[PDB]
């Protein structure tokens with residue numbers, strides 16, 4: 001607890017000493033850095049290792065860094081003296097592993113990335129290995145943040161990142177404002193955002209971390225200038241269990257998006273803005289949910305902009321959904337989940353397509369209206 005805080009401080013010192021963020025940015029390059037967190041994965045790790053070995057010369061100062069980035073083993077005695085004591089502290093914290101004979105250090109369940117200028121530990125199981133992850137991050141996380149107008153954020157603006165997960169959106173907002181609230185209800189994400197807050201030299205002085213249900217924060221009396229939320233939004237067929245980060249509420253998975261949008265006229269200060277993201281079902285003309293938002297244009301004079309950045313036919317999602325459901329619940333391979341998914345997509349969701357959509361909503365707009373951007 002204080003030992004962990006000191007360990008994260010020393011980790012931060014190591015990342016600074018060897019220029020981690022710059023090395024990550026160089027490896028992935030500027031045309032990929034903000035596209036997706038799934039850049040260093042089990043399918044690219046061999047190439048990452050080759051770069052460290054052949055272009056960075058295998059320098060020992062980068063050995064602990066690779067343990068964190070890909071899980072690659074480093075011989076304990078080969079670590080530089082300062083990095084060796086940090087490695088021991090990370091093993092004690094459960095953030096790296098030691099081999100059974102203690103002669104090397106290697107990856108545990110946390111992967112070190114950089115996103116939007118922040119250093120971030122994420123759940124390594126999303127990009128490596130074969131066990132279902134407990135903390136989500138994905139391209140939807142990134143595209144939510146991409147559309148934020150950072151130059152319009154004042155130091156005194158009050159911002160909230162609901163359903164914060166790893167903390168990425170809250171930490172991004174903390175680059176610009178000194179008043180950030182980050183919320184979640186999962187034990188595992190809450191422990192991780194606490195680590196990532198400290199990893200970026202923040203504390204409760206400028207970023208509050210709160211265990212609180214989305215609808216409780218939304219009903220509350222606190223008012224915000226800026227809101228971000230990537231909520232659970234996936235609709236799974238009746239009878240199937242997902243995970244805390246994936247399964248949306250309501251008949252079509254969008255209950256949490258409805259909850260948020262409905263309270264924006266009250267929770268945002270006049271002229272404040274919210275950024276949401278979801279993979280929205282729709283027909284050939286667009287996502288069904290945008291039709292529900294005309295009530296916010298007419299009823300509350302908001303401006304609402306929807307940025308559609310990925311389109312897939314519903315049939316292309318049947319496999320990924322069924323695979324996720326099978327793996328999350330440990331179901332056997334003879335269950336016809338795919339037919340259940342198809343039937344649900346067509347009766348309940350009316351989903352011909354899925355549209356990965358970032359939505360910007362502004363209260364008290366001078367130019368109210370709904371705008372849907374498609375390529």
Ligand SMILES: Nc1ncnc2c1ncn2[C@@H]1O[C@H](CSCC[C@H](N)C(=O)O)[C@@H](O)[C@H]1O
Pocket residue numbers: 136137138140141142162163164165166167168169183184185186189212213214215229230231232244245246
């Ligand atoms: N009712 C609820 N109230 C608050 N958080 C919730 C919630 N239900 C699920 N969550 C949290 O919602 C998150 C959705 S995943 C989004 C994580 C992060 N904001 C990102 O963009 O990458 C998960 O971390 C999950 O624990």
Ligand SMILES: [Ca+2]
Pocket residue numbers: 027028029
């Ligand atoms: Ca590369």
Ligand code: NA
Pocket residue numbers: 045046049072
């Ligand atoms: Na490897």
Ligand code: NA
Pocket residue numbers: 230231232233245246
């Ligand atoms: Na989500």
